[PDB]
Amino acid sequence: RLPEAYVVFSPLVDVFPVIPVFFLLLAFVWQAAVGFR
């Protein structure tokens, strides 16, 4: 368990590890936005 002063932020911590993939998906989204120039 996290130190008592930060236990409230547990749901955010449970989501951080996966953020680095959303970047890879965002690259494709950006490419599709400009219509695959």
Partner 1 sequence: MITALTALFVLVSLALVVTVPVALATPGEWETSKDQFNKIFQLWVGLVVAIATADGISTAI
Partner 2 sequence: IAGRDIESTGFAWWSGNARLINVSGKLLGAHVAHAGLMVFWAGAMILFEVSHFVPEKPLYEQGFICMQHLATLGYGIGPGGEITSTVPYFAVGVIHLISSAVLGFGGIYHSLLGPDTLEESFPFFGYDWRDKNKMTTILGIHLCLLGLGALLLVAKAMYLGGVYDTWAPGGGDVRYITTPTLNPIVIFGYVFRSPFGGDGWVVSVNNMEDLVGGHIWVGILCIVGGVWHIFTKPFSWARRAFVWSGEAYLSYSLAAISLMGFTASLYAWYNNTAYPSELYGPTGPEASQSQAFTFLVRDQRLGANVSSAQGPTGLGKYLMRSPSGEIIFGGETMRFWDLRAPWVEPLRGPNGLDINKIKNDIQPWQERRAAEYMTHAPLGSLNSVGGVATEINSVNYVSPRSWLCCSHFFLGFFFLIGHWWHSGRARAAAAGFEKGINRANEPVLSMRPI
Partner 3 sequence: MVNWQVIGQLVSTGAIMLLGPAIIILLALKKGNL
Ligand X SMILES: CC1=C(/C=C/C(C)=C/C=C/C(C)=C/C=C/C=C(C)/C=C/C=C(C)/C=C/C2=C(C)CCCC2(C)C)C(C)(C)CCC1
| Positions that interact with partner 1 (CB under 8 A) | 3, 5-6, 8-9, 12
Q: Which of 2, 21, 4 is nearest to 12 (CA)?
A: 2
- Binding map of partner 3 across residues 3-32, x = CB under 8 A, - = no contact: --------xx-xx---x--x---x--xx--
Measured distance between the N- and C-terminal CA atoms of the chain, rounded to whole angstroms: 48
Task: Write the CA distances from 20 to 3, 4, 34, integer angstroms.
Answer: 25, 27, 23
- Binding map of ligand CLA across residues 1-37, x = CB under 6 A, - = no contact: --------------------------xx-xx------
